[PDB]
Amino acid sequence: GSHSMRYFSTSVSRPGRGEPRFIAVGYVDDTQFVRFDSDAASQRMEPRAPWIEQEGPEYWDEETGKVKAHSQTDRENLRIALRYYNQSEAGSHTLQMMFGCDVGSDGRFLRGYHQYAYDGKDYIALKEDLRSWTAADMAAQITKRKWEAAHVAEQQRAYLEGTCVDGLRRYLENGKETLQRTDPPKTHMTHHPISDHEATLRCWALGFYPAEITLTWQRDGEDQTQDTELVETRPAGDGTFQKWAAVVVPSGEEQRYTCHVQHEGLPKPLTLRW
Amino acid sequence: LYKKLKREITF
Amino acid sequence: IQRTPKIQVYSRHPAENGKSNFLNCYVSGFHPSDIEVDLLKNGERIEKVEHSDLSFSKDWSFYLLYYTEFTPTEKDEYACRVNHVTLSQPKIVKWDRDM
């Protein structure tokens, strides 16, 4: 299986209550290893996972320096955008940013990301060729012209391919016990009656990592995607993930339905009959 | 490993 | 443009009376990030409750996990109360061993 590393940063202005709050986190695949909160008294990058605190003070002081430089950059970006768009200073505004790289079962580069959003909408993003920028609006293309002239796309590509990947390959090593495990789901089925004329069949998947999974329902092999409720994939809190799918079926016909589960950790897809 | 630009650059 | 949270309350492990567990409330798909979440015991707030660090998905929507340790009882009821800019009143979602 391939792998990914991401850092997600959020900056929320709070007018009248002081300077914007900046939160940044980071992930290897679906596991978060770090945190920075601009309101925390620590003012340091912090370990969120048992395999990253084996790093030495050379790591944490250097990480801390870069994320706080990012923090003041995004804090100033909020005012530039506020002026770009002529928006009121009484409104709260949000700047989101994410970057990172993907690597394969080999360990070498696949793709990388450098991108920003403003009030939940795309602003400027590095194209997947990593040589050019997509820009949503007119204001973002000012930033595009400023960024193309200053050659930042060339420096970020150097980071994404060079530094991001080697740190990724290192974390996958420091933590290979937890990170490269794939736990298959524990799948079962529960039966909830409603009326005499109808009842609900629910198909569960529990304790699986990574989060990518597919649950589907079939009627006699006809794949019934109508009247099937399927919830978003929720974390269990111990590092694993959960999910379930359900169908309302007329009793007594529950025998004709089959749940279908596919996950990286399964040798072959599971099918379940009530 | 977090990103670092030699000179930080804004919007 | 805003978005309403999608709320899920549930237990870390399947529920058995008397064994300790964790009680989760997962909110997702909302925007902006300001949100209030309480876990309720028979209508009253549980006051040692921890939340995951703020992150977001590919569509920029935010997700958070509020969780705490509890030991369930047949008589005890638990619920999750959430408030957001998109909700004209707070939203209470009851816990169910089967959902």
Author numbering:
A (entry chain A): 1 to 274
B (entry chain E): 1 to 11
C (entry chain B): 21 to 119
Text taken from the publication that reported this structure:
In this study, more than half (54.5%) of the subjects had the HLA-A*2402 allele, and M1 protein-derived peptide H1-P25 (M1 99–109; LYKKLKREITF in pH1N1) with HLA-A*2402 restriction is 1 of the 11 peptides. P25 is conserved between H1N1 and H5N1 (named peptide H1-P25) but has a dominant mutation with substitutions at position 9 from Ile to Met (I9M) (named peptide H7-P25) in H7N9 and H9N2 and Ile to Val (I9V) in H6N1. To further interpret the immunogenicity transition at the molecular level, we determined the crystal structures of HLA-A*2402 in complex with peptide H1-P25 or H7-P25 (data set 1). Peptide-MHC (pMHC) structure determination indicated a molecular basis for the immune cross-reactivity between pH1N1 and H5N1, as well as the lack of cross-reactivities toward other AIVs, especially H7N9.
To characterize the binding of peptide H1-P25 derived from pH1N1 (or H5N1) and H7/H9 variant H7-P25 to HLA-A*2402, in vitro renaturing and circular dichroism assays of the HLA-A*2402/peptide complexes were performed. The refolding efficiencies of both the HLA-A*2402/H1-P25 and HLA-A*2402/H7-P25 complexes were high. Further, the HLA-A*2402/H1-P25 complex was more thermally stable (with a melting temperature [Tm] of 48.8°C) than the HLA-A*2402/H7-P25 complex (with Tm = 46.4°C). The overall conformations of main chains were similar in the two structures. Another structural variation is contributed by Lys4. Although this residue is conserved between the P25 peptides of pH1N1 and H7N9, the salt bridge formed between Lys4 and Glu8 in HLA-A*2402/H1-P25 is not present in the structure of HLA-A*2402/H7-P25. Without the constraint of the salt bridge, Lys4 of peptide H7-P25 in HLA-A*2402/H7-P25 is exposed to solvent instead of being partially buried in the C pocket as in the HLA-A*2402/H1-P25 structure. In the structures of HLA-A*2402 with H1/H5-derived peptide H1-P25 and H7/H9-specific epitope H7-P25, the I9M substitution influenced the solvent-exposed surface and decreased the force of anchoring of the peptide to HLA-A*2402. This indicated that variable antigenicities of nonconserved peptides could be largely influenced by both exposed positions for TCR docking and anchoring positions for MHC binding, which should be investigated in the HLA-A*2402 cohort. In particular, a cluster of conserved T-cell epitopes shared by H5N1 and H1N1 may be related to cross-protection against H5N1.
